[PDB]
Design a protein around this ligand. Structure first.
Ligand SMILES: *[B]([O])([O])[C]([C][C]([C])[C])[N]C(=O)[C]([C]C1=[C][C]=[C][C]=[C]1)[N]C(=O)C1=[C]N=[C][C]=N1
Ligand SMILES: Nc1ncnc2c1ncn2[C@@H]1O[C@H](COP(=O)(O)OP(=O)(O)O)[C@@H](O)[C@H]1O
Ligand SMILES: Nc1ncnc2c1ncn2[C@@H]1O[C@H](COP(=O)(O)OP(=O)(O)O)[C@@H](O)[C@H]1O
Lengths: 171, 512
């Protein structure tokens, strides 16, 4: 219930949302469809981590030792990751970029992502946008349809329990 | 008696917890009411799925090879792959990790192979088709049923079954649901919407089959181990038909070997003239057709026993689909037999050439036969090289430079393409220009370049099968296809005089 949010730093608008949905939940009655759809909505809203970051180690030499030992070559990726760490140090905050590796099949584009997330100690999620044709697989359905699921990024934030989890979008 | 239904069975703690809690809550509610039966069925579901019940795994590889070899004639490569998988699993201690996957043409043995694998490992088989629903519903009386995996557990009454996810490429979000299910780090805690209690699925074995690997999720193929189930040549199909298909059809029709008999020659005829696909899906329907006609003939009273023979099979299955397969038996000076590669087997086709104008200003080549662009360019390259080769070989011929030729690849309604049949077109042009027929039962296939080099081709298996089926005695291949030719069963290549060439001059020495 409301205990899943005392460890979280919840914004104010989502606080109004969860409050009004709790009111709706309380006024409704059990074994009814609306009861269940509001229960799912509130469970998803209380499963999102609303204020937490993962402890990111901005140590340069340790991260370089992490990267240089599980992947041969690929100097550009490691140099960019080290500059990313330096900028995160200077800014004092945990930041975020948008990167893209391009190359022939099987040159380490996918495993370098995992080793990178291990170096920065961020979480790790991967999902492919290859064959998808409808946007509901990212933006999610709507709470009214008969089978409702909140997409594929809210799932990241819920399962990783972080706000800077290094999503890798393959292909 | 609910305590007896799990007494001898090893139960975890947090499961007996909910069991006793529901028993106390059921003593609270009133019996025979719209509140009692629901919780009764739920407490039944808690006390029905096994927890400590297993199946002693079959680790021995000899017994596994025996049970795999009993059923499923052929399939030696898939069998080797399965044996190697069991060896890796025995040596790793567990069986999790990658998820096997069989893909190939339809009706080839991809479901029955999973059943035989289950029988091999002494695991209890269970199949559920994915052609949401794998998680169950919730107990608001809407869905009073668990998922299909919980029903698998209840049915097989064993914690380590072999579930078969059949036809995984016909799936509709179920994609991410399966992606999470097969994961061995989320495997231990599979919470279904019906049973709030988690269940460990880290001992079940998962197999999935498909036909094409062009489904939506690519990260599946990172976790799925692809294994390819190829087709069957006519001999393997005949053996399969005599050992497995005809007995089952007899059982289904209520006949027996004494009443209606299907000899070996009629079965080979049926396969050769009606069923040419890579599977046995069509031959199965054909033998069932024969057996139904036979059942009618014996019941009605036309014959107290029926004997099918290659001179009355058409009375059972109708007109033959395929034909003589040789348009020519003796090739005139102009025509040369090439080999084509379909997706439904091989094919033999001839290349005809003729003069278009009386006397044997340069000449021209007219090309017909519904040829693609690559094939028309191959004809142009072959024309150029044939001119050059005739110049260097018979410098006083004047043919191919002054004559107007027409080149036709018969069966003009069929669209045909490909860089092969370059050497075939060169040979056709040369044999017309010299007025000499090529060797009689000689086939060839190979891509020629502008200077005469013979470049490799594809589909050597199907082309060689179709050549052996058409009475070819000598076949000519590119030298870079020696591997492809020798990775063939010894009975396919047993009686063929094979030649591997790198330049065209060797083809010229063989054909003339
Ligand atoms: B060859 O291997 O490229 C071959 C040349 C053929 C005309 C003697 N091509 C084919 O056999 C094609 C398949 C193909 C292979 C390689 C590239 C492109 C296409 N098959 C046919 O053209 C065909 C002809 N008749 C019936 C069925 N298929
Ligand atoms: N320098 C390297 N060190 C270790 N493994 C590597 C290296 N380069 C490539 N690989 C291998 O390549 C595979 C990943 O290829 P990937 O980047 O996924 O190609 P693609 O995504 O284009 O198919 C992994 O199996 C990885 O082991
Ligand atoms: N090598 C084989 N030995 C014996 N029977 C076979 C063999 N290959 C196929 N069959 C039979 O042909 C049928 C193939 O159907 P199936 O493999 O279930 O279709 P799919 O491959 O689409 O799952 C089965 O009834 C099986 O008994």
């Amino acid at each position: 219930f409301r205990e899943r949010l005392k460890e979280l730093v919840v914004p104010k608008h989502v606080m109004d949302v969860v409050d009004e949905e709790l009111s709706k939940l309380g006024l409704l009655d059990n074994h009814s469809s609306e009861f269940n759809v509001t229960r799912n909505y509130l469970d998803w809203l209380t499963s999102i981590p609303w204020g937490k970051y993962s402890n990111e180690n901005l140590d340069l030499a340790r991260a370089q030792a992490v990267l240089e030992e599980d992947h041969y070559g690929m100097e550009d990726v490691k140099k960019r990751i080290l500059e990313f760490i330096a900028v995160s140090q200077l800014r004092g905050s945990t930041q975020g970029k948008i990167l893209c590796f391009y190359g022939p099949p099987g040159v380490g584009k996918t495993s370098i992502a995992r080793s990178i997330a291990r170096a920065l100690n961020r979480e790790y999620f991967r999902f492919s946008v290859g064959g998808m044709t409808d946007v509901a697989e990212i933006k999610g359905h709507r709470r009214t349809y008969v089978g409702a699921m909140p997409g594929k990024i809210i799932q990241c934030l819920k399962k990783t329990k972080t706000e800077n989890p290094l999503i890798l979008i393959d292909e | 008696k609910f305590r007896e239904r799990l007494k001898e069975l090893v139960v975890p703690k947090h499961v007996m917890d909910v069991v006793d809690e529901e028993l106390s809550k059921l003593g609270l509610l009133d019996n025979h009411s719209s509140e009692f039966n629901v919780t009764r069925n739920y407490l039944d579901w808690l006390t029905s799925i096994p927890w400590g019940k297993y199946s002693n795994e079959n680790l021995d590889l000899a017994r596994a090879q025996a049970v795999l070899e009993e059923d499923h004639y052929g399939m030696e490569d898939v069998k080797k792959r399965i044996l190697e998988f069991i060896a890796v699993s025995q040596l790793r201690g567990s069986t999790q990790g990658k998820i096997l996957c069989f893909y190939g043409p339809p009706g080839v043995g991809k479901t029955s192979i999973a059943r035989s694998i289950a029988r091999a490992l002494n695991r209890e088989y269970f199949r559920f088709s994915v052609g949401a629903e794998i998680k169950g519903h919730r107990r608001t009386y809407v869905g009073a049923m668990p998922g299909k995996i919980i029903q698998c557990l209840k049915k097989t009454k064993t914690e380590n079954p072999l579930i078969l996810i059949d036809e995984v490429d016909k799936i509709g979000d179920p994609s991410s649901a399966l992606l999470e299910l097969l994961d061995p780090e989320q495997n231990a805690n599979f919470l279904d919407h019906y049973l709030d209690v988690p269940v460990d699925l880290s001992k079940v074995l998962f197999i999935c089959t498909a036909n094409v690997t062009d489904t939506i999720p690519e990260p599946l193929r990172d976790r799925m181990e692809m294994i390819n189930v190829s087709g069957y040549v006519a001999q393997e199909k005949l053996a399969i038909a005599e050992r497995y298909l005809v007995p089952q059809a007899r059982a289904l029709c209520g006949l027996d070997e004494s009443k209606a008999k299907l000899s070996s020659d009629v079965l080979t005829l049926l396969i050769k003239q009606y069923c040419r696909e890579s599977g046995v899906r069509n031959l199965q329907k054909q033998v069932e057709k024969v057996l139904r006609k036979s059942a009618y003939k014996i019941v009605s009273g036309e014959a107290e026993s029926v004997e099918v023979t290659p001179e009355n099979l058409q009375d059972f299955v109708g007109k033959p689909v395929f034909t003589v397969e040789r348009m020519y038996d003796v090739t005139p000076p102009g025509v040369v037999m090439g080999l084509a590669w379909t997706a439904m087997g091989g094919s033999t086709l001839f290349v005809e050439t003729s003069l278009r104008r009386p006397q044997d200003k340069d000449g021209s080549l007219e090309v017909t036969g519904q040829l693609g662009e690559v094939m028309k360019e191959s004809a142009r390259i072959a024309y150029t090289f044939a001119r050059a080769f005739l110049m260097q070989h018979a410098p006083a011929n004047d043919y191919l430079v002054t004559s107007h030729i027409h080149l036709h690849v018969p069966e003009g309604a069929t669209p045909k393409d490909g860089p092969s049949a370059g050497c075939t077109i060169v040979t056709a042009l040369l044999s017309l220009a010299m007025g000499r027929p090529v060797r009689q039962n000689l086939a060839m296939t190979g891509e020629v370049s502008l200077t005469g080099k013979i470049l490799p081709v594809g589909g050597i298996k199907e082309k060689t099968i179709a050549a052996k089926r058409a009475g070819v005695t000598c076949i000519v291949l590119p030298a870079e296809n020696k591997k492809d030719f020798y990775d063939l069963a010894a009975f396919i290549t047993e009686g063929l005089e094979v030649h591997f060439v790198e330049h065209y001059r060797e083809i010229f020495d063989i054909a003339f």
